[PDB]
């Protein structure tokens, strides 16, 4: 696909839970990682989402938070993907951070320049990408 989102992950539906107006879709990524997404029930049905369906998960860079220390907090954001900072491209007030994940999957996040300083992000650094389930778009081939 030619889409602006910097994150386009391939995977397979491992389970679906249909709600009233939304549906929760659990996805197993190409390399061990798991994601959850909430999409409208009309999309889950239109896309024919079911266990075993191959899909792509699409996440824009400004929808990914970065965390270097949870400090014992447990978050509601269902998607926590841990890796190492690969590249940092700094702009004026924002910076594009790409992390390398387990298996070689990369994830890019757009965060303020002040976050980069405060978390100590630099190539090599451990960090986790955090993505709320409602910020994941799914796609079917």
């Amino acid at each position: 696909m030619k889409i602006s989102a910097r994150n386009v992950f391939k995977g397979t539906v491992s389970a679906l839970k249909e709600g009233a107006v939304n549906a929760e879709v659990d996805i197993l990524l190409g390399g061990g990682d798991k994601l959850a997404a909430v999409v409208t029930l009309e999309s889950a049905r239109s896309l024919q989402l079911a266990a075993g369906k191959e899909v792509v998960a699409v996440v824009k860079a400004p929808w990914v938070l970065l965390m270097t220390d949870s400090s014992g907090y447990r978050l509601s954001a269902r998607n926590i993907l841990t890796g190492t900072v690969k590249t940092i491209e700094t702009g004026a007030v924002n910076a594009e951070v790409t992390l390398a994940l387990q298996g070689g999957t990369e994830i890019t996040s757009m965060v303020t320049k002040e976050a980069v300083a405060e978390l100590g992000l630099k190539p090599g650094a451990s960090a986790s990408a955090v993505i709320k389930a409602s910020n994941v778009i799914l796609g079917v081939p």
Copy 2:
């Protein structure tokens, strides 16, 4: 309204589906286009949303993806608005892209500078704005 969101569209509710905690609102835009939004049920009731109600849909620029080629994928994002690139304002790491839609409605998206290069966006270029239903705020006059 004096609000930072760059996209404020006028329209009318064409249908409402009330869920348990959320509600799906389908909107017909001023010129042919359609949108779907998911808002809390408490807001749908507080705003008195019903078929025929005039409303505004509010979308911040960083919530709009741009796509130039779906490559046969079908996305869950309910809102796909196709047009032509009007203006590009490039910053350091991000760029503000405005598209002109059918009827003359404009939509602005904030994407990384690398997306602009990779999709070949430039004034005149065909592209679609993609917005997940959960990233639309609605307003009533």
Copy 3:
């Protein structure tokens, strides 16, 4: 926590409404302000959210809209926090705006540079931060 989100608010759950796949959580902030969040029901249960639980609400800067005049519109976005512009850091195409709220809580928003001009934001200026309920992550200690 060491997390990129610029907004991390402490508060207590004042009520919870469980849906089919999502749950709505109403939170009373440390100083008078209130927030609503929509998270998956699986998270609400995993985090053991109930009335009186102390939590943190996490919101990234690009998820906060700024409004200086509603012009009589009522929005669906459940979280409207009013204060005064404290600092503005301008980048190339975006600018980071921090507002000081009632009690001394600060909230930072990332908006286009054109929004800053158009709303007349500058230190001292009245403005409200607007955050859709689905853009709030919750955390438990």
